[model samples]
Target: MKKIPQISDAELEVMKVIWKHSSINTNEVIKELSKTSTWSPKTIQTMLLRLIKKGALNHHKEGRVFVYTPNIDESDYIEVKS
Candidate 1:
């Protein structure tokens, strides 16, 4: 398993979406979060990048878009957080 890093509240919100979907693209994440968040697309993109840097996410180009997956399990993160 990959070492999970400390994540911010904003980043956690993004992680939750990825965990639920297992794998997702940028636009899908943005659309899902739009239901409860006021953040702009740029803000969400920044959060995704931050999560990647933190070693909590993995992404690769799929055609013209990037597909993202969690490097750390949701339960693993929850255990660390608690």
Candidate 2:
């Protein structure tokens, strides 16, 4: 498998959503984030795209909604070789 790309703090925020909730669409992502943040849909969508570009998120279209899933678990981000 290819190495995961580096993720920024903003992207990590988005990653947490995908990590916590599998098969989640943009609408649900926005809804979940609304609980603690006042981010707009566009901002969320932008971060999702960024995550996809960084090989962190796998997104596909389901009708009109776009669902996102995590390509790597939290532990996968850090490699431990001793």
Candidate 3:
């Protein structure tokens, strides 16, 4: 099993949306997360970029918008620490 760095709660939320789908753009993640928190697009972008740096997300430039995909599966990220 490949182990990657852990993600924060905010980063996890964004990751879920990407895992549910294949590839998602920055704006899409912000839209999904907006349902819960009142975070702005830039806030979401910051979190997303952090995940990317952590090797949880793969970012690619497609046309004008940058596309992001989940590199880590949800199961792999789960650990029973109790």
Per-model C-alpha lDDT, please? 0.77, 0.71, 0.71
Give the candidate number with the greatest lDDT.
1
Model 1 worst lDDT run, 10 consecutive residues: 73-82
- Which candidate has the highest TM-score of all? 1
- Compared with the true structure, what per-residue lDDT tens digits does model 3 show for residues 1-82? 2237466777777776678887887566677788777788788878876777766677888777788867767555563441
Q: Per lDDT, what order, best first?
A: 1, 3, 2
Candidate 1 per-residue C-alpha lDDT over 1-82 given as tens digits, one digit per residue, 9 for 90 to 100: 2446577777788787778886998777888887679888888888887778866788988887788978887345553642
Off by over 4 Å in 3: 1-3, 78-82
TM-score to native of every candidate shown? 0.79, 0.74, 0.75
74, model 2: CA deviation in Å? Answer: 5.2
Descending-TM-score candidate ranking: 1, 3, 2
Cα-lDDT of candidate 1:
0.77
Better of 2 and 3 by TM-score: 3
Residue 38, candidate 2: how far off, in angstroms? Answer: 0.8
In candidate 2, what are the lDDT values of residues 1-82, reduced to their tens digit?
2346466666667676667775698788888876657877787878777667766677789898888877778555553331
Model 2 lDDT on a 0 to 1 scale: 0.71
